C-alpha cells in the first residue's frame, strides 16, 4: 500500500503561504521563509496582546495628567482625591471625559479637591 | 425454544445454548476479522538496497569533492535506489481457538433468530437446473438476498443459483461466520438445522 504525499503536502504548504500575505520578498513566496515568518508573527501577536493593555493605560494616564493640570492639580493628587471621595471610575473613562466633556471633568476635579482638602 | 417452520407451521426443537444465548459482540468481531485475514493472499515484494541492480562502486571519493558522502548508488536516499524496509511475501492468517470459533457461531446464530432473519423449512428444491425456476420460487417467498443451507447439496439447486449473485447455497458443513452476517436472510432446511447443532456440540 504505497501512499503518495503530493496532494496533502501541497495543501499544508498552501495554508502557511496564505497567512504570509503581505510580507516582503521571499516571506510571501517561499515556504522555508514564510514558515518562520508566520511563527514569529504568532509569537509577537501573543506577546503584544499583553502589551496592548499596558500601552493604552499608559496613554490614559498621560491624558488625565494633562487635563488635570489644566484645572490646577496633578495626576497623583487627582487620583488620590477620587479614592478618598469613593469615586470608582476607571482611567479608560476618565480619559474619555477629559477629551469629550471638559465640563464634566471639571466637576470631577472639584470633587477630588474637596475630598483631598 | 422451538423454531416455527414454514412448510407445515410445525416446530423444531433447538438447544437454548445454540439458538438462545446472548450476543457476544467482542468475540464475534475477533472471528470475522480473523476470517478476513485468512483470505489475504499476501503476494508482493520490493527490493532492498542489496537486490537493486547496480554496482558496488563508490560514486566519488570520500573526501575532497565538496559533495555529500556517498558509498553506493543503491542507497535508499537516492532516486532509483532500494526501499528501506522492502516487503517480502507474508502469511496474514491468525489463530482462532476452537471454542472461540464455535462460540461465535452460536452468538451469530441466535442473533439471526432474535432479529427474525432466520427462516426454517424442510422443503427447498427445484425440479430442473433452471435459474428462472429458483428465481420464481424466491419471488413467492419474498426473498431476494438469501443464503440457503441444505443438509446435503443437490446439483439442481447448486446449478440453479450460480447465476443469481444475491443468492448462495451451502451445505451444513460449509457455513462460515462472515456469510451468516452478510446476507439479509438465511434459509435453513430442518435437516440442516439438525446437523448444525451437533457440529456446534
Amino acid at each position: 500500500a504505497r501512499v503518495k504525499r503530493g496532494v496533502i503536502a501541497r495543501a499544508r504548504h498552501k495554508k502557511i503561504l496564505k497567512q504570509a500575505k503581505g510580507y516582503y520578498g521571499a516571506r510571501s513566496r517561499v515556504y522555508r521563509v514564510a514558515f518562520q515568518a508566520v511563527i514569529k508573527a504568532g509569537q509577537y501577536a501573543y506577546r503584544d496582546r499583553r502589551q496592548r493593555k499596558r500601552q493604552f493605560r499608559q496613554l490614559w494616564i498621560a491624558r488625565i495628567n494633562a487635563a488635570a493640570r489644566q484645572n490646577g492639580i496633578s495626576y497623583s493628587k487627582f487620583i488620590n482625591g477620587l479614592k478618598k471621595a469613593s469615586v470608582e471610575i476607571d482611567r479608560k473613562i476618565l480619559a474619555d471625559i477629559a477629551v469629550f466633556d471638559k465640563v464634566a471633568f471639571t466637576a470631577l476635579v472639584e470633587k477630588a479637591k474637596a475630598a483631598l482638602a | 425454544m422451538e423454531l416455527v417452520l414454514k412448510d407445515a407451521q410445525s416446530a423444531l426443537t433447538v438447544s437454548e445454548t445454540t439458538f438462545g444465548r446472548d450476543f457476544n459482540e467482542a468475540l464475534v468481531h475477533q472471528v470475522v476479522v480473523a476470517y478476513a485475514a485468512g483470505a489475504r493472499q499476501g503476494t508482493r515484494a520490493q527490493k532492498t538496497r542489496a537486490e537493486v541492480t547496480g554496482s558496488g562502486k563508490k560514486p566519488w571519493r570520500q573526501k575532497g569533492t565538496g559533495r555529500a558522502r556517498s558509498g553506493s548508488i543503491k542507497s535508499p536516499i537516492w532516486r532509483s535506489g532500494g526501499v528501506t524496509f522492502a516487503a517480502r511475501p507474508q502469511d496474514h492468517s491468525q489463530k482462532v481457538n476452537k471454542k472461540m470459533y464455535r462460540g461465535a457461531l452460536k452468538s451469530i446464530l441466535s442473533e439471526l433468530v432474535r432479529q427474525d432473519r432466520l427462516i426454517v423449512v424442510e422443503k427447498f428444491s427445484v425440479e430442473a437446473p433452471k435459474t428462472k425456476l429458483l428465481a420464481q420460487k424466491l419471488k413467492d417467498m419474498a426473498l431476494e438476498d438469501v443464503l440457503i443451507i441444505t443438509g446435503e447439496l443437490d446439483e439442481n439447486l447448486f446449478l440453479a443459483a450460480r447465476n443469481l449473485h444475491k443468492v448462495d447455497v451451502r451445505d451444513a458443513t460449509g457455513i462460515d461466520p462472515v456469510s451468516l452476517i452478510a446476507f439479509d436472510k438465511v434459509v435453513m432446511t430442518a435437516d440442516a438445522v439438525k446437523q448444525v447443532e451437533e457440529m456446534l456440540a
Binding site: - | 459482540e25 467482542a26 468481531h29 470475522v32 432479529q115 452476517i181 452478510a182
Partner: protein, 144 residues
C-alpha cells in the same frame, strides 16, 4: 448485526508507537532514545550480562552441582490423578495410557496433592506417607 456494525472490546486495540513523526506526537526527532551514545545508535546496545567490563555476575560466582540423568525419567503423581485411569488399578503402564506421564518415565511417586474418593489399587509405585494414609482412607490398597 451487519459487517459494518461490529466493534471491538474497549481497551483491546492500543495503537502502536510511531517514532519520528513530529513535535506534537511526543516521540519526534529522537524516538525516545535521548542524545548520543552507544545506546542511541542503530544496532547499538551491549550484550546480555555486560556490566561495563567489570567481571559480570555469572562469571564472578562459582559453578556448583551436576545434572542427574535419573531425574528426567521420574514423575510425580497427584491423588487427583488416580481417578483418571481405567480399571481402578494404577501402575506405570496404566498411567502412560491415560496420558498422565510421559512415555519414557520409569519411576513414579504418588504424593499428597488433591484428594481421592474411590478405592484404587496402587501397584508397583512408591507412595509417600501422607498419600498412603489417604489412599487407604478411601478404601484402596497398596502393593509393590
Amino acid at each position: 448485526m451487519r459487517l459494518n456494525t461490529l466493534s471491538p472490546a474497549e481497551g483491546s486495540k492500543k495503537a502502536g508507537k510511531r517514532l519520528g513523526r513530529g513535535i506534537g506526537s511526543g516521540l519526534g526527532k529522537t524516538g525516545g532514545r535521548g542524545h548520543k551514545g552507544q545506546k542511541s545508535r542503530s544496532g547499538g546496545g551491549v550484550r546480555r550480562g555486560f556490566e561495563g567490563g567489570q567481571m559480570p555476575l555469572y562469571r564472578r560466582l562459582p559453578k556448583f552441582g551436576f545434572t542427574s540423568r535419573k531425574a528426567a525419567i521420574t514423575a510425580e503423581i497427584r491423588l487427583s490423578d488416580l481417578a483418571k485411569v481405567e480399571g481402578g488399578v494404577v501402575d506405570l503402564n496404566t498411567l502412560k495410557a491415560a496420558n498422565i506421564i510421559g512415555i519414557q518415565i520409569e519411576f513414579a511417586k504418588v504424593i499428597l496433592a488433591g484428594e481421592v474418593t474411590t478405592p484404587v489399587t496402587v501397584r508397583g509405585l512408591r507412595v509417600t506417607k501422607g498419600a498412603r494414609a489417604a489412599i487407604e482412607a478411601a478404601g484402596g490398597k497398596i502393593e509393590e
